């Protein structure tokens, strides 16, 4: 049970390709819900069990529900993935795939050197040593510290965020009412 992270990486690739090539618009949206589940798997896998259920609650249970709710009672035309339509795209898809992929891998590195910048992204092989220290006396888990720092050090960010939630109330109402 070593290669779990590699498996989630591969399954996420495959799920995005099934997102962007799908018969029916909501077959594509169910593949997105599956990608959210693969994400939450990776987040529990890395050690963040809190966030995975936050993803399942907020992204799956509200955003995907809103999205499916939109696709139901609105009319959306769709062409399917013809080969006549989209292999005119493929040479720039290949060039931009390799370039954007390498370039996203580039900025984790500090060299003057171009491909020493690149292959330090693959210098991964060393197993981190986890030590126990007995300095912490209480059950401050991660949600507790998020609640301490949203509320003391970044209280202003929480209140500007309240203004953003207010805007998310006012705006959709203001569009779709047709006042008398």
């Amino acid at each position: 049970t070593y290669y779990f992270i590699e498996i989630t990486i591969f399954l996420a690739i495959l799920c995005t390709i099934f997102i962007i090539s799908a018969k029916n618009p909501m077959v594509s949206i169910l593949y997105m819900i599956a990608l959210f589940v693969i994400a939450a798997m990776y987040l529990y896998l890395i050690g963040l069990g809190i966030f995975s259920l936050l993803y399942i609650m907020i992204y799956i249970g509200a955003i995907a529900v809103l999205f499916l709710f939109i696709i139901t009672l609105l009319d959306i035309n769709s062409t399917e993935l013809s080969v006549k339509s989209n292999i005119r795209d493929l040479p720039l898809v290949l060039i931009s795939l390799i370039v954007l992929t390498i370039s996203g891998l580039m900025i984790y590195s500090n060299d003057s050197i171009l491909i020493n910048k690149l292959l330090e992204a693959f210098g991964n092989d060393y197993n981190t040593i986890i030590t126990q220290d007995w300095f912490n006396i209480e059950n401050t888990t991660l949600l507790t510290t998020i609640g301490n720092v949203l509320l003391t050090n970044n209280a202003f960010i929480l209140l500007v965020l309240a203004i953003v939630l207010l805007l998310g109330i006012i705006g959709p109402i203001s569009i779709t009412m047709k006042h008398k």
């Binding site: 500090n110 060393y126 912490n136 401050t140 888990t141 507790t144 510290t145 720092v149 050090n153």
Partner: protein
């Protein structure tokens, strides 16, 4: 801010190297910053472990080519079922 706050609300893993670098930067003005280059280096490889990865690759390159391998007090691996068995 949340400058040095860790997941448990304590100090993070590289807090002490950062606080040494800020102790450096507090008592210096510019034109005199070239002397707190080591503290910053100590901070950066605290973050990313670049020099330790280089050192461990240098030692693993040598232990791969030995027929003898390891003549040392070795290290044991256990299953999680057997931490205090014997």
């Amino acid at each position: 801010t949340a400058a040095g706050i860790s997941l448990t609300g304590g100090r993070n893993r590289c807090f002490s190297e950062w606080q040494s670098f800020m102790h450096c930067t507090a008592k210096t003005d510019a034109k005199s910053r070239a002397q707190c280059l080591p503290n910053f280096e100590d901070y950066m490889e605290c973050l990313h472990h670049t020099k330790e990865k280089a050192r461990l690759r240098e030692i693993e390159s040598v232990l791969k080519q030995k027929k003898e391998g390891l003549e040392a007090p070795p290290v044991k691996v256990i299953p999680v079922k057997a931490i205090g068995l014997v």
